[PDB]
Every structure is written in structure tokens, then in C-alpha cells.
Ligand binder design. Structure first.
Ligand SMILES: Cc1nnc(NC(=O)c2ccc(C(F)(F)F)n3c(CS(=O)(=O)C(C)C)nnc23)o1
Ligand SMILES: Cc1nnc(NC(=O)c2ccc(C(F)(F)F)n3c(CS(=O)(=O)C(C)C)nnc23)o1
Ligand SMILES: [Co+2]
Ligand SMILES: [Co+2]
Lengths: 398, 398
């Protein structure tokens, strides 16, 4: 006499989508942000396109950890190139970069997904409502790149490889580890990438309309947001979108975002880790020496209630580690999610990072090996309530 | 039975009482990431802040300090936050700051000096030809601040205290140690701050004209002519460089001017109490978010040291200079140890010098020990010594 959650997946992608490729931040200074993030997250300096490379238009530095690719880009003076261009990223434009950065501060310009063919992905998107940002451009007859608007001044970037490198894109030089111990805190890939918009409805119509991504449902049972999740056919590309819920006691954090960010844009990046305990131990140590800071931890009560909730999946010693590191735990139909959120990455209370680990949903593919289903454990919607619960209990125990 | 003498003039012709270098303000796109990077790279503690979390709706400003050295990183918030000020720095302007950063990239906006009275300093300066930037403003009846143009978009900022704080300026909250045992690599104060301009003559005329700073002589191509302006006591030192055109190798000064979009501050020399300690600390962090250093001199350079400075430095101290790539020069009065970083941000503009001065220890009216300003000069000899050592190293391949 149990309960059951049932999921639909129409597999309606209008073109073949593979995986998240990279995230591009537009910065004022690529070098300082890239250096800070490298130390904070344990990402390796892996490729570059700048003056030391021939590029007189923009400085672009790629950091990597597993399959996660973070690109930091900033403009040089236009005066350098006031005389075929030395830029490696065809979309890049001085005007656009400066305007974006003045308007929004440090933030994500481009969410990039690898696809079978960027030309067709772009053609199909425009046909089905997508606003063009940058057209399909082939690079050294090796890579095609196109951009459509996602929300705000964020673009969805399509990347397609002509056939079966660590140089990322044409025009980039590989950087070799200048170290006997290169950095690695266990971050492996991008899990989801969440936008904030003024109204969820139109936003969803737009994106899903041109992509054919479907709604991934969350097991449910005050937070100031209303959200839905767009998902690719295999549910490995996940694009949540939030809107503000007006009226509530505490002002919507989404509404604050929209004010400080001067509009819609990317709110957070959930980075998947092979082991959140390792990652957080590393990141927390670096919090006060140039790394990232974390949101205030749950009360003790939260951790007393974990065995009740996840004592089947997590051992006692793992629950103590969760408490020591301020880790939230949620569970859905299919599996269990460990998560934590940083404080903002730059000056404004806009963009932040989530570290997650997914437990469960191991299944066999056609090769005979295992994979983990995308969205295993959900996105931690349970935790808002589980956190308000634990605070009120903590009070009543005081 | 035959020696040489270098004779220094000092007209002590300052037009107002100057005390010391007070702080340096960098204008950024993102103050947090630059401040975090610098803190880790240079070993400077987070001391104070003025931002949203303190009530500041106009600008985010973060103070790092190491001994008497004070670095301030400032960036603009959206105008819309403060359309209805909470600003701690009265001179700050959204448009000016955006415009600076768009034009010059990461750079020093303000060279700040403590004077006895900022109001009179501004008055006497403007009367003697200075172009005013911000008029004298008194803050919480406690501190007075005024600004005049130094060169390009760099301002000389005057700071005077009413009479007889660790909160730097009114409106700034002190930051306590998040972790006991703050970051400290041995940097103790600013030694000098150097500007690049297109023409030395007009620039010196202007500055000396309104300060009454005298010329400080350098005891005895490199693509530059240099002149040093100095306060009465020679503890405030302000070198200025111009390019020497037609030289074989293009002038590094001329490069600066092209990449920076004009005149601006080229380098900051930071005094260390133990340059060996400082550089071991800084070097271990180079590849993990810190700063990179210029290419070391050839082994020849270190072999020539005992002849040049064997009386001041021991054999083991010379091997240490060789381990760390440290340059050594001498003048009339004493000995200098120096090393230069690679650019601090994207552009080949501003960099940092780390110095230790050895010698000219003297006593004052109180009888307290002081070291004279400029002990050992500024390393002008090292241009030749570098060229020599490279010629010698190349000749001995044989
Ligand atoms: C759709 C979708 N995709 N991911 C989600 N949910 C989250 O990321 C999420 C879960 C839980 C929490 C918390 F429990 F900590 F309140 N979140 C928060 C907390 S927060 O203070 O606002 C943020 C500004 C740190 N933000 N996102 C989430 O929804
Ligand atoms: C006055 C005054 N204030 N500072 C100075 N001079 C220097 O700092 C200086 C001395 C020596 C050398 C070197 F030996 F390495 F060539 N410098 C350099 C070398 S560099 O590759 O151009 C720079 C771009 C690192 N830059 N400034 C100096 O003079
Ligand atoms: Co999330
Ligand atoms: Co110098």
C-alpha cells in the first residue's frame, strides 16, 4: 500500500543533443577571475587564446576538472586590432562584452552544449522560434559554432565537431601542467544550469518550443520561486528556470537577483562531484585564503533527522561528515542527492555555485556497462521545508 | 688615493606637509575576485569592507593590508540599486569607474598619501597648477579626502585625519580573522609607485610644480628615460618613465602606453622585511592562483655577485638570490634586492616589484632608528648587468 511517482519522457528533442560542453563567463579581467576560480574549485589551467597566442581581440582562459569546462573571456583595447581577425571565438564582440559586464557584472554569457551538427541545430532552432545571436561558423574546417538567445543576455551555444582534442577550439594552445601536483578536488561535470526570468511561462514556451526539450518532473510534498525543468532526451542536459513568487513574507531571492543583475540571467551552476566530502573539505579550507564562501549551515536538528530520512542510504559517519561540512541531503522517488551552495561568486548577489553528488539510479546501457540516470535524486526541493522544519525544532529544543 | 663621490641635493621644497603613502586603490570590474586573488598571491589580510553587507549600495570596496601596505579594490554596483548616498568613498562615480575599466583594464586609479591637512593640500596644489579631480570632502568629521590628477586617469589622493583607525575610512566595517593566523608573506609597505607617460618633461613640470617634490638622483638601451620625484624626507617616491623611441628593441614603456590606452601607473614596489621569505611564499603559489615572475637571470649573473656585492651579501645569500631569481644592485649609499612579477591582469601594463633595501640605517630627533628613503636606488644598473651576464653566458657555451 505504498506511493509511486511516474515520469513521462516524450523524447521530443528537435535535434541531436549530446552533453554540456562548456560555460563561458564574460569578465572584466579574465586572468584574475580564472586564477581565483582555479584555486577555489580545483580546476586545471588547460588551454588559452590571448596575446601570447596571437589573439589581439580577447583573452580567453579555459579551466577544466574532469569534463567540466569553464572559459573566462575579457576584451583587450579595440585599438590593438585597428589594422581576417586574430579572435578564436567568432561570436566575440568588444561592444557586447563591455556592455554585458557593465550591466550585469561577473556572469555567464554562454551555456554551451555539444550537438551532432551546429548548422542544423541552429537552422531548426530559428525555424521553431529561436532568436539568432551568432550564425553557424566553421573554424579551421574542424568545429562549427552557433548561438541563439536563451534568456536575458545569456546565449545557448551549439558546438559540433566535424569528426571524432584538449585544445578545446581552433586558435587555442594547450597549457601543460606547471606542477607535480595539479589541482583536483573531485569536480567532474556540469549537472544543471539554472536561469532566473521575470515570468516562467513565456520563458518555457520559448526554449522548449525551439529545442523540443521536455519537462522533467520533481517529486514533491514559502521559497519565493516558481520553477520548471527543461530536459534533453537522455536527461543529461538540464535547464531549470525560476521565476519570482511575489507577495511572500521574505522577498523572493529571484526578485533580488533580477534587480542586482539588471534582468534575467544565469542564477547558478550545479557542479557534479565524484565525492562531495572530498570537494567540500578542499573548498572550505580555501574559503578564507582566496577560495569561495558557503551559505550558513543547517542547525544540528537537521542532522539529527537525517537517519530517519536517509539512514538506509547514508551511514552514520557520512551523516556526521554532512554536518561537519554543512551539506544538505534530499531524496526523491529514485535516489538521493547531496548538495551545498556557495555565496555569490563576484560582487553582486547574483550567480552562485552548487556542489552536488547523486546516489542511486545505476542502470545498464547497450555496451553492458552501467550509467547513472540524469536528475537522480531531483534538485533538492525537499530541503527548503526540511530546513524550515529543522530551524523551528532547534528553537523548540532551546 | 683616488675614489668617487656622489653628492645629493635636497631643497626640501614641499609645498605642504606630506607624511607617507597611505593606500593604493585599484579600479576593477569585480573587486571580490581581484581582492581574493591578490590576498592569496601577496599574502595580504582582509581588513575592512564597504559593500551591500555594510549598507553601501553604490560600490563594493575591499581593503587588503600587509604591515602598512593598504590595497583597496573597488567596483561599481548597478546604478538602479541607488537610484533613490550610501557610498563610503565620496569621489566614487559609476560612469568614471566603468569608463576607466573599459579603457585601461585592471589598474591603479588612486595613489593615496597621508598629509597633515587635505583641504590645504588641495588648495595649494590647484593654485600651483594641479587639475582638480575631487574637492576636499570631510567624512564623519573624522577624515578629509581630496583628489587631483597625477597622470592620465590616475589621481593623487590626499588623506588627513582630524587628530591622533583600523577601519581605514568612515563607512568601512573592520573584518575580523575568519581564520586565526592571517595571511602574511612579509610585505610591510609601499616603497615607490611608477608612472608611464608619453613625455617626461611636461609630466615632471606639472607634478613637481604643484607638490614642490624635488628630483631624487640615480647613481650610475632599456627603452626609457626616468625621473624620480620625492617628498622632503624622501619616503614618498614617485618615479615617472617616458619611452625612448627608435631603440633596437621596442620600448616596454611604449608598449604599456598602447595596451593601457595612454599614461598610467606601471608598477608598485613593495618593501619586504625578508625578500627570501616573501619570494618562497609567492613562488609556491604561482601556479595555484598566485603571481608569476619574470624569467630569472642567467647563472652568470649570480657568479658576478660576489665581485659586485660580496661585502654586503654572504655566499649563501647569493645562492638564495639564485634560487629565487632575485636581482641585486648597489648605489652610493646601499644595496637593493628586487624582483618583478608578470602583469597582474590581462593587459601587459601594471606589474609588481618586491624589494628589500640594505644599509643607510640612521637615527632621528626621537633617536628611533630609520632607514633613508631610496637606499640602493631602484636597480638601473641591473639593465646593464643583465645584458652583460647574458653576453657572458652565451660566450661560455664553448
Ligand atoms: C529547478 C531546480 N533546480 N535546482 C533546484 N533547487 C535548488 O537548486 C535548491 C535546492 C535547495 C536550496 C536550499 F535548500 F538551500 F534552500 N536551494 C537554494 C538556497 S538559496 O538560499 O536560495 C541560494 C541563494 C544559496 N538555492 N537553490 C536551491 O530547483
Ligand atoms: C626610479 C625607478 N623606479 N623603478 C625603477 N627601475 C626599476 O624598477 C627596474 C629595475 C631593473 C629592471 C630589470 F633589471 F629587470 F631590467 N626593471 C624592469 C624589467 S622589465 O622587464 O622592464 C619589467 C616589465 C618587469 N622593470 N623595471 C625595472 O627606477
Ligand atoms: Co540546483
Ligand atoms: Co622600481
Amino acid at each position: 500500500g505504498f506511493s509511486k511517482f511516474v515520469r513521462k519522457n516524450p523524447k521530443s528533442d528537435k535535434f541531436k543533443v549530446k552533453r554540456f560542453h562548456h560555460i563561458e563567463f564574460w569578465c572584466g579581467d579574465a586572468t584574475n577571475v580564472a586564477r581565483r576560480f582555479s584555486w577555489g574549485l580545483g580546476m586545471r589551467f588547460s588551454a588559452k587564446s590571448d596575446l601570447s597566442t596571437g589573439n589581439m581581440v580577447h583573452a580567453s582562459y579555459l579551466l577544466t576538472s574532469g569534463d567540466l569546462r569553464f572559459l573566462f573571456t575579457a576584451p583587450y583595447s579595440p585599438s590593438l586590432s585597428a589594422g581576417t581577425t586574430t579572435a578564436s571565438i567568432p561570436s566575440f564582440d568588444h561592444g557586447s562584452c563591455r556592455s554585458f559586464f557593465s550591466s550585469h557584472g561577473l556572469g555567464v554569457r554562454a551555456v554551451a552544449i555539444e550537438v551532432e551538427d551546429a548548422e542544423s541545430a541552429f537552422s531548426i532552432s530559428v525555424a521553431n522560434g529561436a532568436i539568432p545571436s551568432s550564425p553557424p561558423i566553421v573554424l579551421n574546417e574542424a568545429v562549427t559554432i552557433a548561438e541563439v538567445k536563451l534568456y536575458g543576455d545569456v546565449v545557448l551555444r551549439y558546438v559540433s565537431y566535424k569528426a571524432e582534442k584538449s585544445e578545446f577550439l581552433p586558435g587555442f594552445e594547450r597549457v601543460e601542467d606547471a606542477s607535480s601536483f595539479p589541482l583536483d578536488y573531485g569536480i567532474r561535470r556540469l549537472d544543471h544550469a539554472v536561469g532566473n526570468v521575470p515570468e516562467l511561462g513565456p520563458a518555457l514556451t520559448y526554449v522548449a518550443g525551439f529545442t523540443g526539450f521536455h519537462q522533467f518532473a520533481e517529486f514533491t510534498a514559502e521559497s519565493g520561486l516558481n520553477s520548471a525543468v527543461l530536459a534533453s532526451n537522455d536527461e543529461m542536459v538540464l535547464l531549470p528556470i525560476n521565476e519570482p513568487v511575489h507577495g511572500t513574507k521574505r522577498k523572493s531571492q529571484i526578485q533580488t537577483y533580477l534587480e542586482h543583475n539588471e534582468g534575467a540571467g544565469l542564477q547558478h551552476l550545479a557542479l557534479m562531484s565524484e565525492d562531495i566530502f572530498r570537494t567540500l573539505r578542499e573548498m572550505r579550507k580555501r574559503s578564507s585564503i582566496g577560495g569561495f564562501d558557503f551559505m550558513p549551515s543547517p542547525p544540528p536538528t537537521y542532522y539529527q533527522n537525517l537517519k530517519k530520512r536517509v539512514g538506509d542510504v547514508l551511514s552514520d559517519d557520512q551523516i556526521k561528515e554532512c554536518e561537519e561540512l554543512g551539506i544538505l541531503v534530499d531524496r526523491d522517488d529514485q535516489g538521493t542527492l547531496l548538495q551545498i551552495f556557495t555565496k555569490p561568486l563576484g560582487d553582486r548577489p547574483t550567480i552562485f555555485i552548487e556542489i552536488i553528488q547523486r546516489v542511486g539510479c545505476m542502470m545498464k546501457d547497450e555496451e553492458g556497462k552501467a550509467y547513472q540516470s540524469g536528475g537522480c535524486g531531483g534538485f533538492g526541493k525537499g530541503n527548503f521545508s526540511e530546513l524550515f522544519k529543522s530551524i523551528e525544532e532547534y528553537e523548540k529544543t532551546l
